[PDB]
Every structure is written in C-alpha cells, then in structure tokens.
Design a protein around this nucleic acid. Structure first.
Ligand code: MG
Ligand code: ZN
Ligand code: ZN
Ligand code: ZN
Ligand code: ZN
Length: 1218
RNA sequence: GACUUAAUGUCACGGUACCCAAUUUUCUGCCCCGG
C-alpha cells in the first residue's frame, strides 16, 4: 500500500552530483554530499540532468525524527509502546549499511510487552525495516514492509537553471582567517524546491507514527523542510574583447578595468544614462572630449558604442547587460594582465524521566547597521556544470535580492557562542565521535534559516587602494573593489533551539546581537569586518516556545512553523498556533553573565566626531564617470537603505570610507612604530600587524564609516573648486591641465562633523591601546588629512571630540638700482621678468620616504599670517556670474572672492603653487610645469627648446628636483601641505565708488602670454621662470575704471571681488620629514625678507596680489614651539645648502637668488611708486601717452633694438623699458 | 516504471569565501602682442 508524499524546501538546499556507492568514494564532494540532494545527468555533455533525493536519505531523516518523537513521548506513540530498536549491524552477520551513524542515538527505556520479531514488532522496529524480506541488497519493491522511493523533482532541466555553485568556508576563531573551503550547489528552492516521492507501507500498525515523522522531519539536503502527504554572454564577451583591443590600440588597458567598474555602476543609473546620453562629456577645453567615454572604438565613440551594445542587448535587462559587460571587461583585463571535504560506535543517550524538551523559535529582523559584504566567487568560476581575483561580487539569489546565507550566519553564531562560553573547539570535519565541547553541543540543537531581503537594487561598489608607504601614492595595480549592500537593510533572522533548557550563553549571544536604546547590535555577519562590513543589529526580536513533551502533535501539525516564520514575526499572540506560546523569561542582558563577562567587553566602542575645517574630497572616481556633470573629482557618497521607508533614501549620505578611516589609522600607527617600512607582512608579530591584522591573522580593530552628520547645516554642501596648472615660463596656464574638484564645503568656523567609530578587541596591550590613542591624537593634531588633495589642503582635521560612552625676518634686500635712483618715477618697467637661471638642476635619487617619521628629519606645523601689500584677487571661478551682472553684459565673466560657507578663504592650492614657484626659483630646480606640446611661429617645440634638466621630473628612477622633492610629483606625494588661508582682520574689500558692486573692481584684459616676444627667433632659448613685479598699477586701473568698462569689450575683461591691501589671512603649512635645511628654505620661501613679498592670484602683471607672509610660530614634533634662534639656524643651514648648490645670511650674494628677490622686491614698502605696465600695441592704441614711444611696434622691430637686448631686458628684473 | 536510492545506523544546520590594501599623487583658475 503506497502513499505519495511531497517535500518542500524553504531555503536553498544543497545539491551534489550523484555517484553510485562504489564510485562515490572517489570524489570528496560526493562523500561530503551523501546527505545532500543528488543530481544525475540525463544525457551526455554534462549540461542537463535530473535532480532527486534518495529514499535512503528521507528514511534516515524519518528514523531520526522517529527517535526524537519516541524520546519526547518516552518510547510510546498514541498508546502502543516501542522498543529501543537496533542500530548495530554485525559484519559477521552481513554487509554493513552504506551510511553508518556517528551521532548519539536517543535510546529510552523499552517497556514493550514482548520482544520484537518477524511475527510481531513495535512501530520502531517496523519502520526501521528490522524484520521484513528486504535487506541490504535490493531485489524487488514488494519485499519492503516500509519502502522509501526516490523523491524526484516536481517541476530538459539544466544544472545552471536549478543550482548555483557556491564556495563555503571554515573560519578559524583564533586567527579570523578561513582554514579551508568547500563547494556546494545551492539549488533554487523557489522554482525547484518541491520533490515528490512514494512511501510504501504494508501494515498499518506503524502508520500514524510515520505521519508523525513526516511532520517532524525539519532538515533534508541542507535546508528547512515541510514534508506533506500528497547567447548574449558570448557576443558580449566578443564585443568586450574588441573594446579591450581598441583600448589597447590607444595603450589605455589600465582604464579598461575602471571602465568595467563604470559599466558595473551603470546598473544603478538605469537605461536612460545611455539612451538619453547622461554620461559626462569631459571638459570643453580639450577637443577630444571625455577621457574614457569618448575613446574611439572601431571608429566610433565609446558612448555610442555602448548605445549600440545596449540596443543590441535590450532582450536582457539593463542590470544584466551592465553586469555581464562589466564582468566580461574585468575578466578580459584580468586575462591580459586549500580545499577540504570531510571506528563505528553505537552511543545510546537516555534523557532522565520528567525532563522537558522544548523548541524555542527566535524570530527577528537582521538590520544592517553597516554596509555588508557576503563574499561569493565570480560567476565565470561559480558555474555548477564545470569545476587571484580583484573584483568581488556580493552574494545574491536568483532574482538579485541580497541574502544572508545560513552558513555565514551559522558560522558567526558559532564564533559568538565560542566567545560566550569560555572554551570552544576548532571544528574537526571527520570525527567519528561527536565533539563534547559546549559550543558543539549547543549548536547541534540550533537551527537557522537562509535569510533573503525583500530589496533587490544593485549593490554599491567599494573601491579600495593600497597606498605605497614610501611615496604615499596609489600602489600600481593594487586597486580592487567589492560589492556592498546598503546599511539599514533588514533580513528575517530565524533561530530554533531544540533542548531541555535554554542556555545562558545563547541568550547572551542573542542579547549581544540585539540593538537597544543604549546598545549597538553586534552581529558581524559576512566578510571584511576589519573595514566594518557586515555588523548587523538584531531587532524586533520575539521568542516563542513549543513545549514538546506535552504539546507535540500540534508541533507536527503546524510543522514547527518552518515555512511561515515571516508570518510568525508580524502576527501577534491572538493568532499564534496551539502549542506555540511566547517566551516570557528570556533573560535580559543586565544579568546574563556570559554577555557581561565575555561578550560585552569583547569589542569596546570608541565613537568620535572629526571636525574638518577644510574642504573634504574623498574622491569617488567611478562616480565621476557615471553621474552627469563635468567634475573630475566628486566626494564619496553611499546608498543607505531606510527600513521605515522600505527603500533607498533619496539623498546619498556623504562619508569618508571605513577603508579610508582604517587606512588612515593604519598608517598613523605604522609610522610611529616604523612597521609601515617593512618590505613584507607575512607571519609578522609587529604592532601594526597585531592591531590591524595581516594576510594570516584578522584585524583586532574594526573601523566604520566616518559619516558626515553636519550635511544638513551647509546651504550648499558640495563646493566647486576648479584648479589649473600654471606654466613656469609663460605666466598663464594650460587649458588641458585644468581640473575641477567637488569636495564637501568645509571651512574653519563652519566645519564638517564626521561621526566615526572603531571597535577594539578585548586583550589589547597597554602599549597597543596607547598606539591607538596616539593614532587618534595624531589625526586630532592634523597630521593626516582625510581624502584627497591633503597637500593641496583638503580634508584637514580641525579636531576630534570623543564621546562620553568611550617672528619676522630681519634681512633687507638692496633691490634694483634704477627704481631707487628714480624718485620721480619717470621710468616704465615691464610687468614681468624672467629669472635667468642656468641649466643646472640638482636631482636627488635618495628620496625621503613617507613610511615613517624619521628622528633626524623634522615634522611639524607652521602658523603663518598673510598680509596683502596691494589688493588681492582670489576669484571663485565656480560661479562665472558670481557678482550677477552677466544679464547687463553677456559673456563678461564675473567672479566672487574665494569663499567656503560665506567666510573668505585663500585655497592652499594657490598658496602651494605660489610657494612651489618660489621654491623652484629659490632652489634652481626644474620647470615642473611646462607647455611641451606648444609650438612657436619654429623648428622645435617649446619643450624641445627647454633644457633637459629643466624638464619636469617624470618618475622616481631618475632624481627629483628640490621643488619636486618638497612639493611632490605624480609618482611621489609632497612633504608640505598648505592649508586654506582663513581671513581674520583687515579692511576686508577694496571699495571703489564707480563700481556697481563696490566690493568689486574690473581690471584690464588678460590675454594669453606670448612666448614669441620672449623667444623671438629659433636661436633664443627659454629665458627662465616668469615673475611679476610688485607695483601699484592697480591704482592706475582704479583711476581709469570708468574708461575700462567701455574701451574694451565685456567678454575680454573680468570684474571680480577684490580684497584690499592690509588684510590678514592665517594659514598652516604642515611640513613632514623635512631636512634641517629644507625647513629653513621653506621658512625663507614664506618670509624672505623685510622688503620681499609674494604674488598670487589674478592680476599679477597689473599690480594685484602683492602679499607678505610672516610666521607667528613653528611647531615641531618628534610637540614643541621652536624659538627664534633655531629658526635662524634652519634658515642659515638652508643658506649653506644654496651655496653648496651654487659652488645673518646675505641672500644677494647668490646671483639667481638676488635676481629672484629683486623680482619680488617691494619698492613701496618708502616714497617709491614706480609705474610699470605693458606697452601698447601701436601708436594708434588706447591708453598711449604721446611722445613716450612705448608702443609694441618699437620693441617688436629688430631695427630699434636687437633681439638679444630684448632677451636681456626680459631677464633683468626692474630693468627700465622706457 | 526507468533515469535514480537501499533500508535493523547520513551530527554535513559538522565548515562565516575568511583574511589582509587611505582612489589617491602631482598642478596658483592664470594671463599682452601681433596679423
Ligand atoms: Mg528491512
Ligand atoms: Zn522493537
Ligand atoms: Zn566542538
Ligand atoms: Zn607587521
Ligand atoms: Zn622637478
């Protein structure tokens, strides 16, 4: 007599390839998956087949359930008693069973009236098949008193349709690294989770118990069960290959990788980012467009090629098309550039009479308190049919919902239970006996569920670099990315303990994982916990219990709520099933001893807030390539799930990444102990390797995101700051070298508050805790700016708040003779002159590394004030209509003064480039920026005519010039960081009555500098660095301010906010690992003399920007305030370095230093007021004084003066040109 | 039926795809003579 019987899975069950019992021992995977669902191949080719569950496995589960049920009812079921059965086949009697039981079999007291034999037997002996005609060798199906047929899948079927190959893990508790790994085929329970078979039972005497047993089997094939009675990829890989080939024709293979990431980010922007062409077009200055999306692939641009690819691949979705194209591009870029599976003994266990076995069900929501990462292999390597990387995908199910797998949740629960108990074993994989440590005994009663989320938007991608310790730049080829689900994402957490009493340790773990009003949830599920990926908070926790000793038939009838825990969590006490009563004495964490002693002090919280008084640019490089806008650098923002809104929040939260926070702390620790300078970290017991982990041991500190909590306070949170690179010989810039960053608008009196936190392991040393707070103090002092452009002055830490739950230079330059002998100022000088430095540039291959704070070298901070001697123009070029007067005059660019959050600033890029020009001129160093590609009108280019040692330092194989050594190189971070100059005291603006904005002041037209005047013929070379005189031609501009607005066209001049002379700024120069002479030369580059000033900003040939830097304080840590005498010692030892390069310090003895200081001499600092201005173009030109003969026709003609005397008059500072 | 089990004995829910890695380095939004 047969019954048909269907078993339904409710989580992804495990599938293995079917092998027969003799050939099953050859493969370790099938030895592992004896208890799994088997998969055989219907035809040849190893691509299609049939899945089934063996009847021996279902019979093993039913017999285990029968043992548990008869132990719960003390050997009886519905009146008829059962004996203890048999589980000991003698080898002398016959062949052993194919599966030998290793567990502790539950054996009760046998109270049957008669012994069990062929004529009469108990339901235990009958369901076991003790006394039937069937045996170890199967002949016919009619010899079975009880028969379990194979359970065939109820739905040719291919393996890739049903299963996904997944690598599991075995993480060591002491080290945190996986000891080994193994593979399963996690099969789709939603489509192929129903398996139908037949059970043939002959006599009815063991019938009802069997219908009990089908209601009591909770596990088959690695999943929860209810058992009831009754090609685009090939063509896209080809097109990605031809895209990689077209990029390799341009030698842009290294961009292909980030292109893959860019395409893998395009799934977050929908179809319209390609259909409506919202890809960035690149800067309009460069005629070639975008550096990535306008690359010609087979004659057409990459944006239109991607349009054609999407139009050819509209059959698959946009997410699948972008994921497959980015995966193919990453795989082609990767191509072009341990595994462990697995004396019989019968162990009877008799529980005491009167004991109460119960089943606790703990249901809750597993909210992601942090962005989470559950690791999976690449889908090219995770093919179930066919069986180092740098791009890592998060784990998803068949419909791209995020999942917490049962294995990862179970391993994290095992780790936390090993923490809660004092002791714990490492899980042996082939023990014939059960492990007797407390963690294994408690987790043998614990069952969980594979959680999946109701949210399926694509993961954010976290991009990560390793900084080179020596150069403090990105290590080449070390960029790698992972995929994160958002924080706030909730997962249905299911736990089920099957035991006599609920353990104190597991309740301590559940209170440890749960979040409260003053407690953080602490379920570290997933990967990269060191970067704080996957800290989950348990919430909405409800525990109920089935009292299985007396209320067992309605545990069987409801099947333990094994498919409706989602129903169980929402619904309340009134609709609860019979036998399932809520759990009242779940003990709180205030009196749970293994929580308070072992779990609560295990990870100590240090939460703090970083006040950043600078703009903050943690660059999202891929997001600059996918989001619309022409910004090369935008701040990092991340997607955060809102559980209340059940969606991603519409505003992304700006944050400094937890990996950036972790790396900042890691270099802060490793620099103070010198552990960053180690060439390798393998089996290292260094302080940085103990605290932050290595490739063999996990980190004992965990870092979360520095989330910006101040972002609602700023009116415009993202400030636009556009920088440009200034040529050294032409005073203008290069349009192709312009780059605009988009940092967060941070500033001194309106700082960015960044809420970050890190967790410390229990057992930190007295030393290592002091290293951690010393790293925190180093960040607090401002040693480590956050994000990019730290040398430019971005992301500077003004301070750190810890939560309660945790001089003048006395040198006077003589100047030039002609302005001092001209009291009436009838001489007219050129607005710029060229520093006549030779071709000798000293280069050092002994490059000072950034990996440690060297004792003999000097590191500190210079507090400098900045006094404007003439009015200063630092334009805010983000708004080309910052003064709002383009409506009256179209095309007339008008800028405000540079300001972040209303308060007035000078960027440290301007100060840094100015001091870089002064230091490069001071040290006779290389022309670090030059227009190589420009031609004159001629046989050679501009860069060809420049000297070879005057060329910019490219790479660190050759030496670096002192300007390139101090301020940096593309391959080497600079050792000086120039802060943004805040404004304190002065007259603020230069008010002029003729202007409609009295703050503003229009200047003359600023045309491009002409090297044809400076280099007249082919024989003349580059004369030198162009510097501008310190004069008061701004007074001349102010006098003819009425005439300027009509004599020239509006689209040729600019009207800008102008800060008056006498204004005081304050800026910090944080210097790092400088020599004794380098600090002195830098301090001399700040304050060169009594009558020496500096020129920065717009209007330098017009007299604007004459600024005086004087130093209040030099602070040096090894923290102390350096006195005046040691400052003079540093400056004097820099002076001796200048003499040994040339071969009270008197600077004018050095000829090029004398010429540079004469260029930067201030004649009006006295009664001198020289009028210097450019000559007019012709005799009939505007602003020409008649009889002066100061037209450009006179100086341009070689008959009036020779070419060489014009070059000599351009190289002589303050030489009279009239 | 068979693909596809063996039946007096399947802890495989017996195993966290773990572990390490600062998307940053460099760059004054600058400016005068020809056609
Ligand atoms: Mg039998
Ligand atoms: Zn019996
Ligand atoms: Zn154990
Ligand atoms: Zn180390
Ligand atoms: Zn250089």
């Amino acid at each position: 007599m047969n019954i048909t019987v269907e078993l339904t899975f409710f989580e992804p069950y495990r599938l293995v390839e079917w092998f027969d019992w003799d050939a099953r021992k050859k493969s370790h995977s099938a030895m592992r998956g004896q208890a799994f669902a088997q998969w055989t191949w219907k035809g040849k080719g190893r691509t299609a087949g049939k899945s089934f569950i063996t009847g021996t496995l279902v019979r093993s589960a039913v017999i285990k359930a029968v043992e548990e049920l008869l132990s719960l009812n003390n050997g009886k079921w519905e009146g008829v008693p059962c004996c203890n059965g048999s589980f000991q086949t003698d080898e002398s009697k016959g062949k052993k069973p194919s599966f030998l039981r290793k567990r502790h079999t539950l054996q009760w007291q046998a109270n049957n009236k008669n012994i069990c034999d062929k004529e009469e037997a108990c339901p235990f002996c009958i369901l076991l098949g003790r006394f039937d005609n069937a045996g170890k060798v199967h002949e016919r199906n009619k010899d079975y008193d009880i028969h379990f047929s194979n359970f065939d899948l109820d739905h040719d079927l291919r393996l890739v349709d049903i299963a996904s190959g997944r690598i599991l893990n075995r993480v060591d508790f002491d080290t945190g690294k996986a000891k080994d790994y193994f593979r399963t085929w996690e099969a789709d329970y939603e489509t192929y989770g129903t398996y139908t078979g037949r059970i043939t039972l002959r006599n009815e005497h063991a019938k009802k118990l069997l219908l009990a047993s089908l209601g009591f089997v909770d596990k088959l094939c690695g999943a929860l069960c209810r058992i009831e009675v009754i090609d685009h990829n090939d063509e896209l890989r080809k097109q990605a290959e031809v895209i990689v080939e077209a990029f390799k024709q341009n030698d842009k293979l290294e961009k292909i990788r980030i292109l893959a990431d860019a395409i893998r980010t395009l799934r977050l922007h929908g179809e319209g980012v390609i259909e409506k062409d919202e890809l960035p077009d690149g800067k309009e200055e460069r005629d070639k467009g975008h550096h990535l999306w306008d690359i010609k692939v087979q004659g057409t641009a990459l944006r239109t090629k991607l349009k054609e690819l999407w139009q050819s691949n509209k059959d698959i979705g946009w997410r699948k098309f972008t994921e497959m194209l980015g995966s193919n591009l990453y795989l082609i870029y990767k191509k072009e550039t341990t595994e462990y599976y697995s004396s019989d003994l019968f162990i009877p266990v008799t529980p005491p009479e009167g004991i109460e076995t119960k089943e606790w069900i703990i249901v809750g929501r597993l909210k992601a308190a942090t962005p989470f990462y559950f690791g999976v292999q690449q889908p090219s390597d995770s093919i179930p049919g066919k069986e180092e990387h740098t791009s890592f995908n998060i784990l998803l199910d068949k419909e791209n919902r995020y999942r917490i797998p049962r294995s990862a949740l179970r391993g994290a629960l095992r780790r936390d239970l090993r923490t809660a108990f004092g002791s714990g074993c490492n899980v042996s994989l082939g023990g014939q006996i059960l492990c007797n440590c407390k963690v294994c005994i408690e987790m043998r009663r614990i069952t969980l569920k594979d959680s999946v989320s109701d949210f399926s938007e694509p993961p954010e991608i976290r991009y990560r670099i390793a900084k080179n310790p020596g150069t403090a730049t990105v290590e080449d080829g070390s960029l790698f990315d992972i995929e994160v689900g958002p924080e706030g994402l909730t997962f249905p957490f299911v736990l089920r303990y099957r035991g006599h009493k609920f353990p104190e340790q597991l309740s301590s773990v559940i209170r440890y994982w749960e979040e409260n009003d003053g407690k953080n949830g602490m379920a570290w599920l997933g990967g990269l916990d060191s970067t704080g990926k996957g800290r989950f908070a348990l919430k909405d926790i409800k525990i109920f219990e089935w009292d299985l000793n007396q209320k067992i038939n309605e545990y069987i009838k409801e099947r333990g709520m094994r498919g409706k825990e989602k129903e169980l969590l929402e619904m309340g006490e009134s609709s609860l099933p019979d036998g399932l009563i809520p759990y009242k004495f779940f003990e709180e964490r205030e009196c749970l001893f293994p929580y308070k002693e072992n779990l609560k002090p295990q990870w100590s919280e240090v939460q703090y807030t970083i006040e950043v008084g600078s703009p903050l640019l943690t660059a999202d490089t891929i997001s600059a390539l996918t989001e619309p806008g022409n910004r090369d650098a935008i701040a990092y923002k991340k997607r955060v799930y809102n559980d209340g809104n059940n969606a991603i929040e519409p505003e992304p939260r700006f944050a400094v990444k937890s990996e950036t926070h972790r790396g900042i702390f890691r270099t802060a620790v490793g620099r103070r102990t010198g552990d960053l300078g180690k060439e390798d970290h393998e089996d290292c017991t260094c302080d940085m390797c103990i605290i932050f982990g290595n490739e063999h041991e996990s980190s004992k500190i965990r870092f979360e995101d520095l989330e910006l909590i101040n972002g609602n306070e700023f009116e415009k949170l993202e400030k636009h700051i556009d920088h440009v690179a200034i040529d050294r010989f032409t005073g203008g810039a290069l349009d192709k070298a312009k780059f605009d960053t988009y940092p967060l608008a941070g500033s001194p009196k309106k700082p960015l508050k960044l809420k970050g936190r890190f967790w410390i392991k229990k057992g930190f040393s007295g030393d290592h805790k002091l290293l951690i707070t010393t790293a925190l103090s180093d960040i607090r002092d401002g040693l480590y700016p956050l994000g990019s452009k730290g040398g430019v002055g971005y992301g500077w830490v003004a301070g750190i708040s810890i939560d309660d739950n945790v001089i003048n230079n006395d040198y006077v330059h003589p100047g030039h003779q002609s302005p001092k002998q001209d009291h009436k100022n009838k001489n007219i000088y050129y607005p710029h002159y060229f520093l006549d430095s030779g071709s000798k540039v000293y280069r050092e291959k002994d490059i000072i590394t950034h990996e440690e704070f060297t004792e003999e070298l000097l590191s500190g901070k210079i507090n400098c004030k900045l006094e404007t001697l003439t009015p200063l123009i630092i334009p805010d070029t983000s708004d080309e209509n910052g003064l709002k007067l383009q409506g009256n005059k179209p095309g007339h660019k008008n800028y405000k003064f540079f300001n972040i959050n209303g308060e007035l600033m000078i960027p440290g890029s301007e100060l840094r480039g100015m001091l870089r020009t002064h230091f490069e001129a001071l040290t006779k160093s290389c022309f670090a920026i030059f227009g190589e590609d420009s031609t004159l009108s001629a046989s050679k280019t501009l860069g060809g005519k420049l000297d070879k040692a005057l060329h910019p330092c490219t790479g660190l194989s050759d030496g670096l010039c002192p300007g390139c050594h101090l301020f940096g190189t593309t391959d080497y971070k600079g050792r000086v960081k120039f802060g943004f100059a805040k404004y304190e005291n002065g007259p603020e603006w230069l008010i002029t009555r003729g202007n409609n904005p009295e703050r503003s002041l229009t200047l003359g037209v600023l045309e491009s500098p002409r090297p044809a005047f400076s280099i007249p013929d082919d024989e003349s070379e580059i004369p030198g660095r162009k510097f501008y005189l310190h004069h008061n031609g701004w007074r001349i501009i102010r006098q003819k301010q009425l005439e300027i607005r009509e004599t020239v066209q509006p689209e040729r001049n600019v009207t800008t906010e102008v800060m008056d002379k006498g204004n005081v700024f304050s800026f910090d120069v944080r210097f790092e690992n400088l020599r004794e002479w380098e600090l002195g030369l830098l301090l001399q580059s700040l304050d060169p003399g009594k009558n020496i000033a500096h020129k920065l900003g717009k209007g330098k040939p017009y007299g604007f920007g004459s600024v005086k830097i004087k130093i209040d304080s030099l602070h040096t840590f090894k923290i102390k305030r350096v006195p005046q005498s040691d400052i003079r010692e540093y400056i004097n030892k820099g002076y001796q370095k200048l003499i040994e390069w040339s071969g009270l310090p008197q600077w004018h003895v050095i000829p090029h230093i004398d010429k540079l200081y004469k260029l930067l001499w201030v004649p009006f600092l006295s009664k001198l007021e020289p009028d210097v201005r450019y000559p007019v173009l012709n005799e009939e030109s505007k602003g020409y004084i008649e009889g002066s003969d100061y037209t450009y026709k006179k100086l341009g003609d070689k008959d009036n003066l020779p070419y060489k005397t014009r070059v000599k008059g351009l190289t002589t500072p303050w030489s009279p040109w009239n």
